[PDB]
Amino acid sequence: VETFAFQAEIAQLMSLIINTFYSNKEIFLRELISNSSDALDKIRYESLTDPSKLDSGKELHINLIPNKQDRTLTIVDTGIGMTKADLINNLGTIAKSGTKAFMEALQAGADISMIGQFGVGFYSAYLVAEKVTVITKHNDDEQYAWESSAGGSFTVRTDTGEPMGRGTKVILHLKEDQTEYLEERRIKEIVKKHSQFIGYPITLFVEK
Ligand X SMILES: COc1ccc(-c2c(-c3cc(Cl)c(O)cc3O)noc2NC(=O)C(C)C)cc1
Question: Does the annotation list 96 as a binding residue?
Answer: yes
> Which residue type occupies 19?
N
Question: Least distance in Å: CB of 178 to ligand X?
Answer: 18
What residues numbered 120-179 form the site for ligand X, per CB under 6 A? 122, 136, 168, 170
Q: Which of 54, 91, 103, 105 binds ligand X (CB under 6 A)?
A: 91
Report which of 141, 128, 137 is spatially closest to residue 76, judged by C-alpha positions: 137
Applying CB under 6 A, the span of 17-25, 78-86, 173-181, 191-199 interacting with ligand X comes to 78-86
Spatial separation of the C-alpha atoms in residues 197 and 199, rounded to whole Å: 6
Q: Which stretch binds ligand X (CB under 6 A): 7-15, 74-82, 173-181, 187-195?
A: 74-82
Rounded to whole angstroms, how far apart are CA atoms 31 and 153? Answer: 22
The single residue among 77, 137, 178, 181 that binds ligand X, judged by CB under 6 A, is: 77
List binders of ligand X among 2-41 (CB under 6 A): 32, 35-36, 38-39
35 is in an annotated binding site: yes
Query: Closer to ligand X at the Cβ: 146 or 182?
Result: 146
Question: How many residues of this chain interact with ligand X, rule: CB under 6 A?
Answer: 17
CB of 22 to ligand X, least distance (A): 20
By CB under 6 A, tell whether 59 contacts ligand X. Answer: no
Q: Is 79 a residue that touches ligand X (CB under 6 A)?
A: yes
Interface contacts to ligand X, rule CB under 6 A = 32, 35-36, 38-39, 42, 77, 79-82, 91, 119, 122, 136, 168, 170
